Amino acid sequence: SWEVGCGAPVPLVKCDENSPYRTITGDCNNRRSPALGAANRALARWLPAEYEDGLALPFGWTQRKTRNGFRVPLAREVSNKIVGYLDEEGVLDQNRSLLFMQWGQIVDHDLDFAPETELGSNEHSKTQCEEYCIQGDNCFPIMFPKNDPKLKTQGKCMPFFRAGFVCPTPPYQSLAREQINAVTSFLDASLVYGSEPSLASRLRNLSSPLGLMAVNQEAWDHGLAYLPFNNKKPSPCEFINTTARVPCFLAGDFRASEQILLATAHTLLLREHNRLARELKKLNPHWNGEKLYQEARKILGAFIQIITFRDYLPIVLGSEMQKWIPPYQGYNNSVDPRISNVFTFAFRFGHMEVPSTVSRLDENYQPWGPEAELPLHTLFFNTWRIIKDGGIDPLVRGLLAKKSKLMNQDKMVTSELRNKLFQPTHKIHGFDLAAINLQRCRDHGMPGYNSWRGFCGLSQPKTLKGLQTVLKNKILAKKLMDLYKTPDNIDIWIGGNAEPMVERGRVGPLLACLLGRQFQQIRDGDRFWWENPGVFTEKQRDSLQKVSFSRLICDNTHITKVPLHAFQANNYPHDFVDCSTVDKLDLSPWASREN
């Protein structure tokens, strides 16, 4: 509320109700309500927003005001007391590859983005936020608690800007502030193609009628394509090494260069689109560039859907997968396809799955040169290590043969993210993702832990002893009670991630319910779901069933040895097979003549 920094460009389109292709914006998916799931609309509210003043001020804004008669603890203080840890020894997930973590961030970026208020460029506002730590309007700074080492080294706060929100509309009657989702709620490879028509065009190769995506013209990975550079200045990717001066990539998603392995996955996905386009041109020489672009985009979309639902969700949801995502029963136009506000916090479980280092491995999956293993923080907004230090293959090998961090109640978020995060506007490896997540929960008017437990039909702990029983952890429950005083005030991000994981899963009960419900809606509410009859032919669906991440790697790198099950922990060579033994995508069912 209070209009400073609101709204988004929602362009009005007339719907082609008979197109066999998704729109870029996600409009026209639901025929009765064409905006359901589209980009640049409010996140859905599963529960009503909870603000300090009932409208827009987050809990923790006014020093006098309590939440249920208790002060809310500082975000940085929750992080210091509970989220940090020293010893990286034995922290690794023994049955999840690093690809497990990385695929999570990919799916998340496809589904939701809540961009920070653009106070504008040229800002004295940025100055009063970063330099003077002054709370007001969109500046909601993360204040350091007493004894914080960052007090001695950085200043009084980390700067923090409130998320974008819907503009008050001409009734202008009093409503709770609603944050915007800038990407399509559909699992539709929007992170490759864009959620905005203008960027979608700019990303395409329109010089040739071959339906390709634009590729870098200054740099090649032993003949394989790189994403184009984003030429917008100043560049955070240039800032982290001004000698090398390699800019950030330009992708369908603003966040693609945030860390080197995300950039890697974006590169693999772009290569696959061009491979699909080239193969379809061979099968159908009469097909034009639009047709080729849309058909490759339509396949890559299904690829993301199949990998997510067949390979990823089962090993996240474990025993709860069947309860929340039973067998598909066809498209239901009454299901809400939109991403909920709470989901964008629930999926941040992945921040406890990121380890402290990244490795480049050689063709024998051995340490690649003398600086093989690098600290994660050196790789935020880092494109020069790809362009000028061996391409993506050595990073992709590390994705296969290295492990995700395991979530640990005593070891939650590696110091690489908790103390050394780099933000694209700022100059320091000095931010705390855990403190930002907690601040952001409050920014977004999140109901509290016991609110969501109830939403999920779970018991709502009210005492120390009750919380100890939910967490199966005496000390964690005590630290939480000392900070929050009531489990009612525990911010959903820490509350959900504190719970011991469900059987065969990587999240606890509350997160299994919130994620499960959302992924059920993402499938059932999507008119272009790959299994919805008439989206693909039956023969095309038989072809699609054989896709794998292992094949993506074989088709789009010079790696010739890969595991069959890329998401579990895999050791070279015992667990790796030659690419020739891995099922391919049979494209003959897309062959199209007139006779």
Ligand code: HEM
């Ligand atoms: C750097 C960051 C990562 C890795 C080194 C990382 C990783 C993940 C994984 C693995 C996720 C899911 C399985 C995931 C989800 C979401 N993230 Fe997170 N992430 C890194 C950095 C960030 C930053 C910075 C943000 C924004 C924080 C803010 O509130 O201001 C962030 C957010 C999210 C998020 C909300 C929507 C989005 O931007 O993705 C997730 C669902 N991540 N990350």
Ligand SMILES: *[C@@H]1O[C@H](CO)[C@@H](O[C@@H]2O[C@H](CO)[C@@H](O)[C@H](O)[C@H]2NC(C)=O)[C@H](O)[C@H]1NC(C)=O
């Ligand atoms: C757009 O597509 C065209 C045609 O495929 C690309 O052009 C060629 O690029 C390759 C690699 O640079 C060369 O080996 C060919 O000799 C080029 N052919 C022509 C017609 O010039 C072009 O580079 C693509 N553009 C972008 C930005 O990706």
Ligand SMILES: *[C@@H]1O[C@H](CO)[C@@H](O)[C@H](O)[C@H]1NC(C)=O
């Ligand atoms: C790793 O997880 C997968 C889950 O589908 C399972 O098939 C495999 O046997 C597991 N390995 C373990 C638990 O060591």
Ligand SMILES: *[C@@H]1O[C@H](CO)[C@@H](O)[C@H](O)[C@H]1NC(C)=O
């Ligand atoms: C910057 O990149 C160059 C090569 O371009 C390398 O030799 C140097 O170590 C890098 N510097 C930093 C600050 O990482």
Ligand SMILES: *[C@@H]1O[C@H](CO)[C@@H](O)[C@H](O)[C@H]1NC(C)=O
């Ligand atoms: C479709 O959606 C609505 C709301 O989710 C639900 O009441 C109904 O049972 C569903 N119908 C079918 C046919 O699955």
Ligand SMILES: [Ca+2]
């Ligand atoms: Ca999407």
Ligand SMILES: [Cl-]
């Ligand atoms: Cl919500």
Ligand SMILES: [K+]
């Ligand atoms: K992110």
Ligand SMILES: [Zn+2]
């Ligand atoms: Zn090569």
Ligand SMILES: [Zn+2]
């Ligand atoms: Zn700064």
